From Swiss-Prot, chain A:
Protein's organism: Saccharomyces cerevisiae (strain ATCC 204508 / S288c)
Domain of life: Eukaryota
Span within the parent record: 272 to 356 of 434
Segments forming a coiled coil: none
Function: Involved in exit from mitosis and pseudohyphal differentiation.
PTM field: Phosphorylated by the cyclin-CDK complex PCL1-PHO85.
Assembly and oligomerization: Interacts with the G1/S-specific cyclin PCL1.
Name this protein carries in UniProt: Probable transcription factor HMS1
Amino acid sequence: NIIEKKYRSNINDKIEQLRRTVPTLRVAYKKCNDLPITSRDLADLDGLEPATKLNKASILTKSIEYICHLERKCLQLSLANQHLS
Amino acid sequence: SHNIIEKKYRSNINDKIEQLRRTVPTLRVAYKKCNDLPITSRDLADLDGLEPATKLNKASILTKSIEYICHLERKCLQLSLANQHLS
DNA sequence: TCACGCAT
DNA sequence: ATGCGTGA
């Protein structure tokens, strides 16, 4: 079934977008592909430990990690902006 | 067995996709409507202008999660630029 | 680990 | 759309 291939492809395509969006996944992809790790890349981590394996589960796990981190960051920042920290 | 370890492989992925549905606000509100749950004022605000998801399949959970990541990333710059008095 | 065909 | 089987 070609249709069934579209369902797998569309899920995989969104998996790759998370890899190219989450900093802990962008850094890992650079190592195995022999790409330059810059201080910009190290700055995007914001202290988060870079991912070692690049499977689907790790991509999802890191995406969950990045979402909660960004949330806490926004919260603390807004607490400073509204003079609440 | 190979079927058993493959079952734990498939279950492990689905456990994390369900976890995203329990974290992204556009999916939490969508889950409340499909399960006939009271959508409060705080639920609507968490969306921060993002539209709730219509379908709740795996692909929908992923695409709304990517949307939520970009929203929080944009809201950190703005919030930060102001904190540093740059704006 | 992932893709795939199938029964659901 | 998706869990399962299975070959890879």
